[PDB]
Design a protein around this ligand. Structure first.
Ligand code: HEM
Ligand SMILES: [N]
Length: 184
């Protein structure tokens, strides 16, 4: 179960975050692990498509090869805090699992600048029991977490030393598919 009400960044700049570009997860902290593997690759694109607030997601397990993409429209709870349904899609946006009641995630942007972000997400999916997930994002897939985002981790009363890095997993991403999924 999720236990945190994450606080969105004061003065969050929504147009900069939702600019249509790709974010890569470089480090993550799951408050309920054996929630997720110890090795993982994830990325997203976020933008406004025909007036609608969207995110496309990519997950890859580099050991099992389990791969999936999702498209989400984001509903606004408050600035920097969103509730998103999701549909599972192939990389071309064809629907594999439709939007469904009970399948949604919350998404809070705790910190963001032009290059980096810290987010919280609580996933709800059927009758699974899932927990709080924090993710450090970067516009560059290879970027070590810099001082601004590491300080934000501290300011959220978390320890960056506990975050698990995705950098050793040889992650390769289809940026083109993530961007085009925003429209789907
Ligand atoms: C970037 C922020 C993230 C968001 C918004 C997000 C969101 C989601 C969503 C919406 C699903 C369900 C997809 C579907 O069934 O169609 C999902 C599944 C999953 N995610 Fe993430 N995720 C993120 C990052 C991560 C990270 C970093 C990990 C590794 C710790 C991870 C591990 C997983 C796993 C293992 C599943 C499958 C759970 C299941 O089969 O029910 N995700 N995620
Ligand atoms: N997730």
């Amino acid at each position: 179960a999720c236990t945190k009400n994450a606080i969105a960044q004061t003065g969050f700049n929504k147009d900069k975050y939702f600019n249509g570009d790709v974010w890569y997860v470089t480090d993550y902290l799951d408050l309920e692990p054996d929630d997720v593997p110890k090795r993982y690759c994830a990325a997203l694109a976020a933008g406004t498509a025909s007036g609608k607030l969207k995110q496309a997601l990519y997950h890859y397990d580099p050991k099992t090869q389990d791969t999936f993409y999702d498209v989400s429209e984001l509903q606004v709870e408050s600035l920097g805090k969103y509730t998103a349904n999701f549909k599972k899609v192939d990389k071309n946006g064809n629907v594999k699992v439709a939007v469904t009641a009970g399948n949604y995630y919350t998404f809070t942007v705790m910190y963001a600048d032009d290059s980096s972000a810290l987010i919280h997400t609580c996933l709800h999916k059927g009758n699974k029991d899932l927990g709080d997930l924090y993710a450090v994002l970067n516009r560059n897939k290879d970027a070590a977490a810099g001082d601004k985002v590491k300080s934000a981790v501290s300011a959220a009363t978390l320890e960056f030393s506990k975050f698990i890095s995705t950098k050793e997993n040889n992650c390769a991403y289809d940026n083109d598919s993530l961007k085009s999924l925003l429209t789907k």
